[PDB]
């Protein structure tokens, strides 16, 4: 029953006949159906005229691949065409070009296509006819969509050089909120819309102007509700005087109060400086106080227990690493820490003392679910993964939650160095369970703000989140249910509600501006569009030359040193790379220098100081330990400067690969 | 003035500690009840599993006043045959069966539950509430006092058993009576 509602057909009218264009409708008005219907017409008409016609659907988040695959494309075209849903996780058994050569409707993630296009056999953009691009507002400065569209745009200008051609496939892109690039001018807003349009090579925004009231009947504005809180507990201040004593021992000036982002930034940078000097007795202290700071930050966000466990785990493994070498400022720390931590665990265990935010959260959950009486799905959006997982535990523990029938689970993306990484198969079944309804409360992160189509979402909740305007429009859109309630929770300490306010005004700017561009004069539209097209290309070329000149290298010039100690580790010639991917050292005396340690299939490298260096790896039948450039210090031979790099790509050195004859 | 016309059938009330729930707490000469996260030990027999309490008084006319801390609470009266165990995940029984009459107040709107059925009634701002019950006419009505007297809703029925007030509460919610 591919029967569109009136406004849908109305805004689809220009699309039915060429005219690569854009469609934007407010969230929850089934744009996917417009895509499906347009696709059917395109393929059928091309079949009537008998030309090779295909269509590729690009999505930017893995979960949506399976959703859009089995929810809107399978059920409507099981008899008419060959639709295949492919993502980077599914184990292919056939090359991408043959995958496309077999089917005709593809649903894939954009990174796959771009990979397949820079492999010049690969594939050419011309092989396609219709390019459906969902959630294309991400078309911005060097994003995955921008690369693909820049190839398309380059070819178009080449065609214009030819005219004074090769067909360029028709383009469609779906948005809900193009947004502004942080603009307090009407000019910058409308400019920004134009920049998106040109980079999409669109023709007309084409947003509804006829069937307004029925639209007002379909979409529902959720009810906004504010939960803002602002109890004294020594634990915060207990950590305070401990860490102030720590800072005063080395008599550091904070330049700001503790527990703040500037303080953390200062701590990291000064720790880098101290390591540059080679200053021990300070470096370690700086790192430890930093650890306290992040512990406090988690502490304010979540319950006491996990924050303590984080610190306890760090110091436990710290002394574990230290005692390995057995087989002055160091002990200066644990001695006081361990008495204090025993006391803290005594203080932390007391559940009567509680965070302010968590309190209001409990109030909100109970109020909403009890008022709903077993007809309620709620989505809570957070910031950090461990926040999601700990909040899941917090739901688990207090039995007062379960009595109300709330069933909770945590959903995060794949891939760290923590409790446990959740894998793709698990989240796939998790969303399956959520749709069924015996998982009643879902705790999610950034991963699932764009595209979820659960027909029952009475509750959408934001937990201390700060973000741009699109990440708020979409969040309000998720409540795809009647009497939908959108709740913001935060404490007045930070800039949260003010971010909400500015986001609101920015939203209104965006609507008015898109109405403004909606009514421009076609020739001026064309001129401005063309000029913008040019601008992107020339700037890309300039960046290209800048980068290639920036790349500028003796593979022996440098030598590596510890940070905790400064003992020379090895020279430039000792390092070899596996598959351009992993640096490693084979030197046998260098094997004697370090220490292995296990808790194991892989061993961790430990210095004489106790600092880690690398991990044991086995490759092509060889046994061999690798190293991380973060763990070391670079020393040149022309200039004796002490430098560090978080990753390997910064270092301009190039290494020989692996003589495997050894 | 109508409140004055009422108060000659005003009746004073007090709870029963046996029927109080675990997390619940009684105070002020058993005329005030408060809810806490901490449990008051195990519940045990004679206590309503779901978050309700019933007062020591029942009526074989009658008026009384009630003040409440905040919304998201329920006030009502049932036959002495109200269930005490639990079968549904939702933590309220009143109004589900025809043996009780309920009225739940929320920040949005009013809902009067009986026999599992309820309708939306325009919400109110105040917390102090009043109610009339006539055994002769079998009529139960609910009133609001602040700032003015609102005849919220009337219930018609025939009662063959004495009626006992039962109150449904939320965590961090406190409920108090009045006396004269
Ligand atoms: N013609 C229609 N008849 C019934 N429901 C429709 C129709 N068009 C759209 N919908 C609704 O739209 C929903 C799909 O919306 P979707 O496209 O996933 O949201 P968005 O447009 O925000 O991406 C379906 O669940 C369906 O209920
Ligand atoms: F409008 Al959508 F996913 F396309 F919420
Ligand atoms: Mg969508
Ligand atoms: Zn060292």
């Amino acid at each position: 029953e591919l029967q569109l509602r009136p406004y849908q057909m109305e805004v689809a009218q220009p699309a039915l006949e060429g005219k690569n264009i854009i469609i934007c409708l407010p969230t929850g008005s089934g744009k996917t159906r417009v895509a499906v219907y347009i696709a059917k017409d395109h393929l059928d008409k091309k079949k009537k005229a008998s030309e090779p016609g295909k269509v590729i659907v690009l999505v930017n988040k893995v979960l949506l691949v399976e959703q859009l695959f089995r929810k809107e494309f399978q059920p409507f075209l099981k008899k008419w065409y060959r639709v295949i849903g492919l993502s980077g996780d599914t184990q292919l058994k056939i090359s991408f070009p043959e995958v496309v050569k077999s089917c005709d409707i593809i649903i894939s993630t954009a990174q796959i296509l771009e990979n397949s296009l820079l492999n010049l056999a690969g594939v050419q953009l011309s092989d396609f006819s219709l390019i459906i691009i969902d959630e294309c507002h991400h078309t911005n400065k060097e994003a995955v969509y921008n690369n693909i569209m820049r190839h398309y745009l380059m070819q178009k200008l080449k065609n214009n050089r030819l005219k004074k051609v090769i067909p360029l496939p028709q383009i469609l892109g779906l948005t809900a909120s193009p947004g502004v690039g942080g603009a307090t001018k009407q000019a910058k807003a409308e400019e920004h819309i134009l920049k998106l349009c040109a980079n999409l090579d669109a023709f007309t925004i084409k947003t509804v102007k006829e069937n307004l009231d029925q639209l007002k009947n379909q979409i529902q504005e959720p009810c906004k509700k504010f939960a803002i809180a602002d109890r004294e507990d020594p634990f915060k201040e207990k950590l305070l005087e401990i860490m102030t004593r720590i800072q005063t021992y080395c008599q550091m000036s904070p330049m700001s109060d503790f527990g703040t982002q500037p303080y953390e930034q200062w701590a990291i940078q000064m720790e880098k400086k101290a390591a540059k000097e080679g200053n021990r007795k300070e470096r370690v202290c700086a790192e430890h106080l930093r650890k306290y700071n992040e512990a406090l930050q988690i502490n304010d966000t979540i319950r006491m227990i996990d924050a303590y466990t984080h610190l306890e785990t760090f110091y436990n493994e710290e002394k574990d690493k230290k005692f390995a070498v057995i087989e002055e400022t160091d002990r200066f720390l644990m001695t006081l820490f361990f008495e204090n931590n025993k006391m803290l665990k005594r203080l932390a265990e007391n559940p009567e003392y509680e965070n302010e935010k968590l309190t209001k959260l409990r109030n909100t959950i109970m109020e909403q679910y009890t008022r709903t009486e077993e007809s309620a799905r709620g989505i809570i959006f957070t910031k950090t993964r461990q926040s999601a997982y700990a909040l899941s535990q917090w739901i688990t523990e207090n039995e007062k939650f379960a009595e109300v029938g709330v069933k909770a689970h945590h959903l995060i993306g794949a891939g760290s160095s923590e409790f446990k990484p959740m894998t793709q198969n698990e989240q796939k079944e998790v969303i399956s369970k959520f749709r069924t309804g015996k998982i009643n409360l879902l705790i999610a992160t950034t991963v699932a703000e764009e595209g979820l189509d659960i027909k029952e979402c009475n509750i959408v909740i934001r937990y201390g989140l700060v973000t741009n305007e699109i990440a708020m429009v979409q969040a309000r859109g998720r409540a795809r249910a009647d009497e939908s309630t959108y709740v913001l929770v935060a404490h007045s300490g930070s800039g949260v509600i003010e971010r909400e306010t500015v986001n609101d005004f920015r939203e209104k700017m965006m609507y008015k501006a898109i109405h403004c561009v909606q009514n421009m004069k076609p020739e001026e539209y064309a001129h401005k569009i063309l000029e913008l097209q040019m601008q992107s290309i020339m700037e890309k070329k300039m960046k290209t030359k800048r980068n290639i000149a920036k790349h500028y290298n003796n593979p022996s010039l440098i030598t590596f040193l510890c940070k905790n100690c400064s003992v020379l580790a090895c020279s430039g010639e000792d390092i070899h790379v596996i598959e351009k991917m992993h640096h490693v050292n084979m030197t046998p005396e260098f094997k004697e220098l370090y220490i292995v340690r296990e808790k194991q299939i892989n061993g961790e490298i430990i210095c004489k100081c106790g600092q880690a260096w690398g991990t044991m790896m086995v490759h092509k039948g060889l046994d061999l330990p690798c190293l991380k450039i973060r763990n070391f210090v670079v020393v040149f031979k022309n200039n004796s400067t002490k430098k560090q790099y978080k990753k390997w790509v910064e270092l301009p050195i190039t290494f020989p690969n692996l003589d495997y004859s050894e | 003035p109508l409140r004055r016309k009422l108060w000659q059938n005003y009746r004073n009330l007090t709870f029963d500690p046996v029927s109080a729930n675990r997390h619940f707490y009684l105070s002020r000469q058993d005329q005030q009840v408060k809810h806490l996260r901490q449990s008051r030990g195990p519940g045990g027999p004679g206590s309503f599993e779901l978050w309700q309490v019933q007062c020591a008084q029942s009526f074989q006319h009658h008026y009384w006043e009630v003040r409440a801390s905040d919304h998201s609470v329920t006030l009502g009266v049932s036959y002495p045959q109200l269930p005490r165990s639990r079968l549904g995940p939702h933590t309220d029984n009143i109004g589900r069966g025809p043996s009780s009459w309920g009225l739940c107040v929320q920040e949005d709107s009013l809902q009067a539950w009986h026999n599992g059925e309820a309708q939306r009634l325009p919400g109110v701002s105040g917390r102090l509430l009043g109610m009339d019950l006539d055994l002769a006419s079998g009529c139960l009505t609910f009133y609001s006092l602040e700032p003015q007297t609102q005849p919220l809703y009337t219930f018609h029925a025939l009662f063959n058993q004495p009626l006992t007030p039962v109150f449904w509460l939320l965590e961090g919610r406190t409920l108090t009576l009045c006396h004269q």
Side-chain angles (χ1 to χ4, degrees), chain A residues 568-580:
Chain A
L568 184 64
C570 65
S571 180
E573 284 305 317
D574 307 336
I575 286 303
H576 322 305
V577 298
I578 283 175
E579 309 208 13
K580 305 276 161 55

mmCIF file of all heavy atoms in Angstrom, chain A residues 568-580:
data_model
loop_
_atom_site.group_PDB
_atom_site.id
_atom_site.type_symbol
_atom_site.label_atom_id
_atom_site.label_comp_id
_atom_site.label_asym_id
_atom_site.label_seq_id
_atom_site.Cartn_x
_atom_site.Cartn_y
_atom_site.Cartn_z
ATOM 1 N N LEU A 568 67.901 5.601 28.331
ATOM 2 C CA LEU A 568 67.772 5.378 26.901
ATOM 3 C C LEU A 568 67.165 4.006 26.649
ATOM 4 O O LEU A 568 67.565 3.015 27.265
ATOM 5 C CB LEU A 568 69.137 5.486 26.230
ATOM 6 C CG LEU A 568 69.128 5.358 24.712
ATOM 7 C CD1 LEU A 568 68.344 6.504 24.129
ATOM 8 C CD2 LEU A 568 70.539 5.339 24.165
ATOM 9 N N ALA A 569 66.181 3.951 25.753
ATOM 10 C CA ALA A 569 65.496 2.703 25.440
ATOM 11 C C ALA A 569 66.079 2.040 24.199
ATOM 12 O O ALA A 569 66.547 0.900 24.263
ATOM 13 C CB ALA A 569 63.996 2.955 25.259
ATOM 14 N N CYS A 570 66.070 2.741 23.074
ATOM 15 C CA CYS A 570 66.622 2.223 21.828
ATOM 16 C C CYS A 570 66.740 3.387 20.855
ATOM 17 O O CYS A 570 66.275 4.498 21.123
ATOM 18 C CB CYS A 570 65.758 1.102 21.254
ATOM 19 S SG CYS A 570 64.112 1.631 20.761
ATOM 20 N N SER A 571 67.365 3.122 19.719
ATOM 21 C CA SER A 571 67.594 4.135 18.706
ATOM 22 C C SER A 571 66.628 3.939 17.546
ATOM 23 O O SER A 571 65.778 3.044 17.555
ATOM 24 C CB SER A 571 69.042 4.099 18.222
ATOM 25 O OG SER A 571 69.258 5.096 17.241
ATOM 26 N N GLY A 572 66.783 4.789 16.530
ATOM 27 C CA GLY A 572 65.831 4.804 15.432
ATOM 28 C C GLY A 572 65.840 3.529 14.612
ATOM 29 O O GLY A 572 64.801 3.095 14.113
ATOM 30 N N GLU A 573 67.011 2.913 14.459
ATOM 31 C CA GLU A 573 67.130 1.782 13.547
ATOM 32 C C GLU A 573 66.505 0.504 14.093
ATOM 33 O O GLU A 573 66.391 -0.476 13.351
ATOM 34 C CB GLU A 573 68.599 1.544 13.214
ATOM 35 C CG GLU A 573 69.150 2.554 12.234
ATOM 36 C CD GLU A 573 68.341 2.616 10.955
ATOM 37 O OE1 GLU A 573 67.961 1.547 10.436
ATOM 38 O OE2 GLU A 573 68.071 3.735 10.474
ATOM 39 N N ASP A 574 66.101 0.485 15.360
ATOM 40 C CA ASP A 574 65.627 -0.744 15.980
ATOM 41 C C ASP A 574 64.150 -1.026 15.733
ATOM 42 O O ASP A 574 63.689 -2.128 16.049
ATOM 43 C CB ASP A 574 65.891 -0.694 17.485
ATOM 44 C CG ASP A 574 67.339 -0.386 17.808
ATOM 45 O OD1 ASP A 574 68.205 -0.660 16.952
ATOM 46 O OD2 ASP A 574 67.614 0.134 18.910
ATOM 47 N N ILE A 575 63.402 -0.083 15.178
ATOM 48 C CA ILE A 575 61.952 -0.197 15.086
ATOM 49 C C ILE A 575 61.551 -0.599 13.676
ATOM 50 O O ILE A 575 62.067 -0.065 12.686
ATOM 51 C CB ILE A 575 61.268 1.115 15.506
ATOM 52 C CG1 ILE A 575 61.356 1.278 17.018
ATOM 53 C CG2 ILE A 575 59.822 1.144 15.053
ATOM 54 C CD1 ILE A 575 60.760 0.122 17.771
ATOM 55 N N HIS A 576 60.630 -1.555 13.591
ATOM 56 C CA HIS A 576 60.100 -2.033 12.327
ATOM 57 C C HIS A 576 58.584 -2.096 12.440
ATOM 58 O O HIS A 576 58.030 -2.207 13.536
ATOM 59 C CB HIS A 576 60.691 -3.398 11.984
ATOM 60 C CG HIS A 576 62.135 -3.522 12.351
ATOM 61 N ND1 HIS A 576 63.092 -2.635 11.911
ATOM 62 C CD2 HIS A 576 62.779 -4.412 13.141
ATOM 63 C CE1 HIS A 576 64.268 -2.983 12.401
ATOM 64 N NE2 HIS A 576 64.107 -4.058 13.150
ATOM 65 N N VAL A 577 57.910 -2.026 11.297
ATOM 66 C CA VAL A 577 56.459 -1.907 11.263
ATOM 67 C C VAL A 577 55.861 -3.147 10.620
ATOM 68 O O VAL A 577 56.451 -3.737 9.709
ATOM 69 C CB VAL A 577 56.008 -0.638 10.516
ATOM 70 C CG1 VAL A 577 56.519 0.591 11.227
ATOM 71 C CG2 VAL A 577 56.501 -0.661 9.086
ATOM 72 N N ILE A 578 54.693 -3.546 11.113
ATOM 73 C CA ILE A 578 53.915 -4.633 10.538
ATOM 74 C C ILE A 578 52.761 -4.031 9.757
ATOM 75 O O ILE A 578 51.899 -3.348 10.329
ATOM 76 C CB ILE A 578 53.397 -5.590 11.619
ATOM 77 C CG1 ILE A 578 54.516 -6.507 12.097
ATOM 78 C CG2 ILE A 578 52.249 -6.406 11.087
ATOM 79 C CD1 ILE A 578 54.107 -7.387 13.251
ATOM 80 N N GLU A 579 52.768 -4.274 8.447
ATOM 81 C CA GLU A 579 51.664 -3.926 7.557
ATOM 82 C C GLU A 579 51.305 -2.449 7.656
ATOM 83 O O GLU A 579 50.137 -2.070 7.583
ATOM 84 C CB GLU A 579 50.445 -4.798 7.846
ATOM 85 C CG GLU A 579 50.743 -6.281 7.878
ATOM 86 C CD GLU A 579 49.542 -7.119 7.499
ATOM 87 O OE1 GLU A 579 48.565 -6.550 6.975
ATOM 88 O OE2 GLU A 579 49.571 -8.345 7.726
ATOM 89 N N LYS A 580 52.319 -1.607 7.823
ATOM 90 C CA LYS A 580 52.125 -0.174 8.006
ATOM 91 C C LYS A 580 51.221 0.127 9.188
ATOM 92 O O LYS A 580 50.694 1.233 9.303
ATOM 93 C CB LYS A 580 51.555 0.474 6.740
ATOM 94 C CG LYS A 580 52.372 0.223 5.491
ATOM 95 C CD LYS A 580 53.511 1.217 5.364
ATOM 96 C CE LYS A 580 54.583 0.710 4.412
ATOM 97 N NZ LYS A 580 54.028 0.355 3.081
#
